[PDB]
C-alpha cells in the first residue's frame, strides 16, 4: 500500500568477475571475486582460501582490475559501476579494524552516447599510464593516471570504428596502445591506435590492420617476450605482432564458443581458455626472442566458465553465472577440490507449504543446461561446534551421571558393531574409559539413570541392573532359555525388553529386577516406548509399539498388555522409532518410519484411541527420534538425512529444520564444559554443539544436467511439474544424459495436429520427497514448454498439469502455432486429458475463478473446461504488443507486456468479457509482474528496476495508472511469488533473480515510511560507502529514457546495516528524528524476523 | 522472439543490449499503422510536427494555414484502434493566430508547460500550453524558416532563428533581448538546430550552399564550415567551403551528437563529423530534395543501428546513418512529404505531408 520495503533474502551467488593479484599486502596473493552487488577478497593459502573481506557496493560491478603505478607499495584496484561510477580503491587495515579506502572516484557517464553492444569494457595499461574505457560506440573514454586524478576526470576520444568486439592494451610499446577487433561490412578486423594524452587523440599504431575471422570474438594481450596479440575465433585462433602471422584451427574448438581466458604463465606461455560447453583448454605458446607456434590441449570439464583465474600450483577458481561456481585442481581430467553453491539464473520458482506448517519453502529452477538444477531454500538452524571427534559408526548415544551426588552428567555411552564404549568427558576433555556394572563387550540397546540411586545398561545380552553408589551388579535379567534382546526401551523405573515376537516386562525396584507380564505378539516386535507421560509417580500406564509383517502401531495398557488401538499404517515400509511426549498440554504420539514419513497422533491416556492423523515426511533414511529438554519445554530431535527438530508452540506443531547433512543419533547432554548442549553423530564423526538461535538458510541442490524452465506444485499428487529443455545435436542424440533420460517411466507426445542443434522439451514429474523423476514426457518435434499449471478446472475436480507450448521452425522468428495440453498424474502414470490448437506461443497460464487464463501471443484469452473434457474460450482481448506475464486477484487480472508496462485488465461476469479498467503508459520493458493487493502492483523493469502503480480515484481519466514507487534494485528479477520463510509489515512477496539473488518485498503504512526514510539518509551521512558512491543515486530509477530518485521504497539492507555499524555513530543517526537509541535497535531485529 | 526471451531470463546476453538489439528489429518491419489516425484539422500541408521530450504523450503540429494543432497520441478506448485527437489548437478565431505558414513548432526543452511557433509571418511566438494564451512575440525583417532550442540543458535560453536574412538571429527568451546575431552566411538560412551533445554549439544551414557550427558564447566567427571535398579540391575563394552543390536546407544531429546530416537541393545527404567537419563519404545515393523551404527530418534512437528518416517525394526513405544502406521508403502519402518525426518510446514515426494528413507508422508483429 503506497509505500513498500525491499530487503535481501539471498545475496547474489553468481560470479561475473574474478581477479588475482597482491591486493591485501605485497606477498598475499589475493583472489578477488565479483558477484554483481558484492566484492569478495581472499588470501590464497596452500590449503583452501582465507576470506579476508566481503563488501557491498552501490552499483553492479562491470569492471574490476588490479594495477600498481610507479611509487605505490601494493596493487590498487579499479572498479566501475553499470551506472558508470568509477573508483580507484586501496586496502589498508590496522589491527583487525578492517578498512577499504578510496583514493579516487568519478562517474564517467556521458549523458548520451549509444552504449556499445558487447557492453562496457575496462582495460588498464601495462605501465599504468592511463585507464581506457569503451563504453559507447564511436567513443573511447580515457581516464588518465600521470597526476593526482582523484576526481577521475577523463576526456573522450572519438573512435572512427563503431562496431567493436573487444579491446586491450599491449605490452612493451613506447606509448599506451590499444588493440581491438572492429567490424565494418568487410567482417571483423584487428587494428592499433597509439594513445596520446597531450594530443588527446589516437595516432598511428605500430602495425597495420589485418583481416581476421567472421566470428573473431576476443583479444589476448601477449606479454613482453614474443609480444603481439592473440585472437580467439570460433573456427580458428590467430596471432599478430606486426612482423609475423600465425594461425591454427583445431577441430577441438569449433564445437562451441570460447568465452573466457586467463594468463597462467606470467611470461605469457600458458593460457587457460574456456567455453559454454564447460570445457577447459590450454593455450600454449612456443619460444631475438619471438613466437614459434601455438598449441591447445583439452584439460577437462568444468562448470560453464564466466571468469577464471589460476591461483598457484594447478589450482584454478572458476566463476560462473550459469551454475555452481567451482574451484578446480589440474591433474587428462580435472578434479574440483571445492565447489560453491550459486543459484544459477533463477528462471522460475515456487513457494511450497510442505508440512502444512506456518512456514513455506522455496524451490527454484536454477541454472541452465549442464549446471541446470532445482534448489531447495528454507530456514534452518546450524550448531555451534566445540568438539567433533572422529569415531566412525556409533550405533547409539546415551548420557549418564557418574556421581549420584552431582546434578550434572559426566558419562556418555556409545553403541558399536558388537560392543559398548564408555566416554568420561573430563569436564572439558573427552576421553575413553571403563565402567563396572556396564559391559564393554556387548552391544548396548539402552542405558541411563534410574530410581532408588541405581543405574541401568541394557545390552543385546541381558538386562543388567547396577547400583551406582558402589558399582557392580545388583540384578540381571535374561530370557529364561538364555536369549538376546530385540528392541530396548526404558525410562527410570520400568523396562519392557522385547524378544522376537514376545514381550518380557520388567520393573526396577530397589536392588531387584521384577517381572509382571509376558506375552506373544501377532508379529515380531518393531519399536517401543513408555517415556514418563502423566508421571503421577514416575510411571507408565501404556506401551507404544509397532510391528512388522502388518506395519501396525499398537498402544497397549501396561500391566494387562491388552490392545486398545491397533493402528494400521499400510505400506511395505516398516516402523523405525516411536516416542510419547507432551507438548504445551496435549498428549501427542510420534512414529518415525524407515523412510522418514512420520505420523503424529492425538492421544488420551485414559482411552488411548488415536485421533486425528497426519504424515510429515521429514527425511528419507530411517528416522530415529529423541526427546531433549530445550529450556522450558522438551523438543524432539529426529534423525534422518534431512535432520529435524520438533517442538510445539500454541497448540499446533512446528517442524524446525536443522542445518546438517545427516545426523544418525542424538541425546540431550548438559555437562559443565557443555551445559545444556547436544551429542550428535553421523557416519564418520561425533559432534557436540548448541542450538543456533540465529536462524539461517538451508539449500539443497538437486542436479539436472539440462535446463529447468517452470515449476509448480501439485498437493494431491504430492510432487512437482517441471519444464525441461535439453539440447541435442543433429535422428539426433543428446550430448550428456539428463534427468529426462533417466526417468522410471517415460512417454513421447502423440499429437498429429501440427502438420544443427535442437531443443527437446520434457515435462518432469518430480516426487516432492525422493526428488526423483517419476515421469518424463517428451513433447513434439520442436515444441517449446513455456507455461505450466497445477490446478483443477471446471466442476471436474481432477487436478491437472497443463502446459502451453509453441512450434519452433528456423524460418519464422515468431511462432504462428502452439498448443495447450492437459495432463494428469495419478496412480503412478501420466494420463493425457485434452488438447487445444492455437495460432502462436503461450507465454502465460494461470487459473482464474474456475477458468484457465492464457496469453496466446498478443492476445490474452480465457478458457472454461467443458464437461466434454475439452477447452472452450469464453472471451478474448486483442490489444497487446506481447502478453508475457499473468497474475490474478479476484476478477482483476494484471498484464505485463514486452514494452507496454502493465495493464490491470478486468472481468465483469454479467456479460462475461474483458473490460480494460486501468493501464500504465510508461513504456516499460517488463521482466516480472505481481499484485500485492487490489490497489497496488509491483513490476520488474528490464533495466533492473522496480516500480509500483496504483489505481487513481473522479472521471474517465481514472484509466491512467499512477506510479507510486520507484526503485533500482540492480538485480534482473525473473519471477515473483507470494509467501514467507518465517513463522512490522504487511504481506510477503518473494523474488528470484538472474544473479541468484532472492528477494523479499512487503508493504508499509506512512507512519513507518517516513520514520524509516530519514533514518536511511541519516545512515548515508555516517556510512562511508565503498567507492564513495551515494545511495539514493544507486537507488534512483535509471534507464536511458529517465532517471528519478528512490521514492516509495525503503531499502531494508541499508536499514539492516545499522546493526553492523559502530556504537556512538548510532547515537549520531538518532540526533533529532521524530525516538531514543534502544527503540530502534529492537525493531530493526524485528524486521529481520521477516526474511 | 523466443530465443530473445530465453537469453534474457538466463542472463546470457545483456538485457538492455537485447532491447537495443530488439528495437532495430522493429524499426525494420515498421509499416503504416492502419488502425491509427491523426485527426484532420490542418488546412495546409504540414510543415512541422513535434513530440514531447518527456514521456512523448502530446504532439504539436504546424501548418501552412498559420495554425498550431496540439494532439494527444495516447489511446484509452477499449479498442485496439484509435484516432489521435487534438486537445487544443491555435485556430483562426484565436487572437494571436499565425497569419501565414507555420514552419517550425517546438516543445520547450525541459518545460512542457510552454512551446514555440515561427511562421512566414516573420514572428516567433512563445506560448502557455495550459492556458493557451501567448507569452512573448518576436518580430523579424524576414520570413522565418527555422527555429530551435538546445535539448541539452537550461544554462541558456537562446532560440536560434533562421530567417531569409543571411544574419543568423539568436533570441534570448529570458528577457526580450533579441539583439544577439551571428554573421557569416550570405543567403537565406533554411535550417537551424543545436547539438544534443554540446551545450552552446549551434549548427546553421543556409542557401549559400554551406553549413556552419557556432559556439554562441563566441562574439565573432563560426567554428567550422563543412567542406564536402575535404580540402582535396583546389577551389578559389567564396566558392570553396561549400557543403552541398546547391542550397542546403536540411539539418539533424546524430542521436549522440557526434555527426551531422546535411541534405541539400542537390539531392544529396551527407554525413559529417560534427567536430572537425570531415565528410564521412557515406553515400545514401540520390535523395530527391527539390524543396524551396526547410526539410524537416528526424533520426532514430535507442536501437543498435541508427536510422535516419528523410522525406523522399511522397514517401519517407529510411537509411542507416552509418551504413548508408536504405531499408525502404515508407509509403502511405499521396502527396509530397514535408516532415517526419520519430517516437523513441515505441519506435514509431509520424509524417506530416502536403496531403494535409498526418500519418502514423508502427512496426508490424
Numbering used by the authors:
A (entry chain A): 1 to 287, 294 to 337, 345 to 743, 748 to 772, 784 to 981, 985 to 1014, 1023 to 1113, 1124 to 1140
B (entry chain B): 1 to 365
Q: Could you share sentences copied from the article?
A:
The versatile nucleotide excision repair (NER) pathway is an important defense mechanism, which removes a remarkably wide spectrum of DNA-helix destabilizing lesions, including those induced by UV irradiation, via two distinct damage-recognizing sub-pathways: global genome NER (GG-NER) and transcription-coupled NER (TC-NER). TC-NER is initiated by the stalling of RNA polymerase II at DNA lesions. This triggers the recruitment of the SNF2/SWI2 ATPase CSB and the CSA protein, which promote the assembly of a large repair complex that unwinds the damaged DNA, excises a single-stranded DNA region containing the lesion, and promotes DNA synthesis and ligation to seal the gap4,5. CSA comprises a seven-bladed WD40 propeller that, through interactions with DDB1, assembles into a cullin-RING ubiquitin ligase (CRL) complex with CUL4A/B and RBX1 (CRLCSA).
CSA is a stable component of the DDB1- and RBX1-containing CRLCSA complex. In this complex, it directly associates with DDB16 and likely functions as the substrate receptor. Importantly, the interaction between CSA ΔN and TCP1 was substantially increased as compared to full-length CSA. These results show that interfering with the CSA–DDB1 interaction, either by depletion of DDB1 or deletion of the DDB1-interacting domain in CSA, strongly enhances the interaction between CSA and TRiC. Importantly, we observed 11 cross-links between CSA and TRiC subunits CCT3, CCT4, and CCT6 involving CSA residues Lys34, Lys85, Lys167, and Lys212. To unravel the effect of such disease-causing point mutations on the CSA protein, we created GFP-tagged CSA constructs harboring patient mutations A160T, A205P, or D266G, which are found in WD40 repeats 3, 4, and 5, respectively. A160T and A205P have been predicted to interfere with the integrity of the overall fold, whereas D266G is expected to have mostly local effects.
